[PDB]
Write a protein that binds this ligand. Structure first.
Ligand SMILES: C[C@H](OP(=O)(O)OC[C@@H](O)[C@@H](O)[C@@H](O)Cn1c2nc(=O)[nH]c(=O)c-2cc2ccc(O)cc21)C(=O)N[C@@H](CCC(=O)N[C@@H](CCC(=O)N[C@@H](CCC(=O)O)C(=O)O)C(=O)O)C(=O)O
Ligand SMILES: C[C@H](OP(=O)(O)OC[C@@H](O)[C@@H](O)[C@@H](O)Cn1c2nc(=O)[nH]c(=O)c-2cc2ccc(O)cc21)C(=O)N[C@@H](CCC(=O)N[C@@H](CCC(=O)N[C@@H](CCC(=O)O)C(=O)O)C(=O)O)C(=O)O
Ligand SMILES: [Cl-]
Ligand SMILES: [Cl-]
Lengths: 135, 127
């Protein structure tokens, strides 16, 4: 396990795994507090500890992120895995959307246009994962 | 709601995430294998008894099992309980081996059994 805050740095191996191309699951909570888990891409900025998901505004995952205010982003590749937990909010500012799209293209590829795109921003505070990555 | 293509995806070898809730209701999400029986709609995770994921399954009673392979993905949601019966554990180990490979021996192994009530996933897998 590791805490994440202004004084922390994830291990080099964990950061590498986060920069490599991997798909993930986004977990949020529904209004009844049941977990909502859906496949996404995401990006993680080690300088700010902000994880981003681009998605459609008003989509279920966006509604939950906004309403309950928390999210987890989780990826696995065999023995390596990580879950990044934190506080979440939805940003619909078009310049923030563009910044998110540019970040997404680095990890994945240029995304298809989406006039209703928003960003879920997650301020990562705790990480779970495989023992070799943590540190 | 699960099509033939969804059932095939569930039998193919893929790793997954198990989501449970901690005591404070925050989601605990960890990499696992799982098996799914289409006849009974039971999904199973084998794990160590007293492990965090097992504690949460027992305490909060809810789980999700979620897998992705590119454009294909599914999340199977339902009510969860922990079964430590030695014949249930052996049966869950054999099922795990069908999908993955024979698991390491572990006398403290238990089964998180999830009765799947709701499925989310890619549109092309759902009916
Ligand atoms: C992440 C960890 O959860 P866990 O201990 O349930 O999970 C351990 C492993 O099962 C995972 O690493 C799992 O991902 C490994 N794994 C799998 N595990 C499987 O089981 N089955 C599979 O099929 C499987 C397949 C698989 C495939 C690929 C792969 O990459 C990994 C795979 C955790 O929360 N860790 C916490 C600590 C948890 C903790 O505190 N544990 C306590 C026991 C629980 C407990 O006492 N909890 C207290 C709280 C204690 C506290 O405050 O610290 C409570 O709930 O009241 C202890 O070790 O003694 C942390 O990072 O800090
Ligand atoms: C699964 C779905 O949630 P979603 O609509 O938030 O997600 C749609 C897609 O984004 C996902 O399929 C996602 O996995 C697609 N996807 C990606 N999506 C991305 O967005 N970003 C990515 O980077 C991404 C990458 C990616 C990579 C690989 C891959 O295979 C897939 C990828 C869901 O809950 N569906 C429910 C229905 C939900 C619902 O009711 N939606 C409401 C709107 C939300 C709402 O207002 N909800 C109400 C409740 C509605 C009710 O009562 O039912 C509320 O919470 O108050 C509606 O359509 O009207 C179901 O099937 O049953
Ligand atoms: Cl999008
Ligand atoms: Cl185990």
């Amino acid at each position: 396990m590791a805490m994440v805050n202004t004084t922390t740095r994830l291990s080099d191996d964990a950061l590498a795994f986060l920069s490599e191309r991997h798909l993930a699951m986004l977990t949020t909570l529904r209004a009844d507090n049941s977990p909502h888990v859906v496949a996404v891409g995401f990006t993680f900025d080690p300088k700010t500890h902000i994880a981003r998901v681009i998605t459609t505004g008003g989509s279920q995952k966006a509604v939950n992120a906004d309403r309950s205010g928390l999210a987890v982003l989780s990826q696995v590749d065999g023995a390596r895995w990580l879950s990044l937990e934190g506080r979440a909010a939805v940003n619909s500012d078009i310049d923030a959307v563009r910044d998110a799209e540019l970040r997404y293209a680095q990890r994945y590829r240029t995304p298809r246009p989406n006039p209703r795109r928003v960003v879920i921003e997650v301020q990562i505070e705790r990480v779970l994962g495989s023992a070799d990555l943590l540190d």
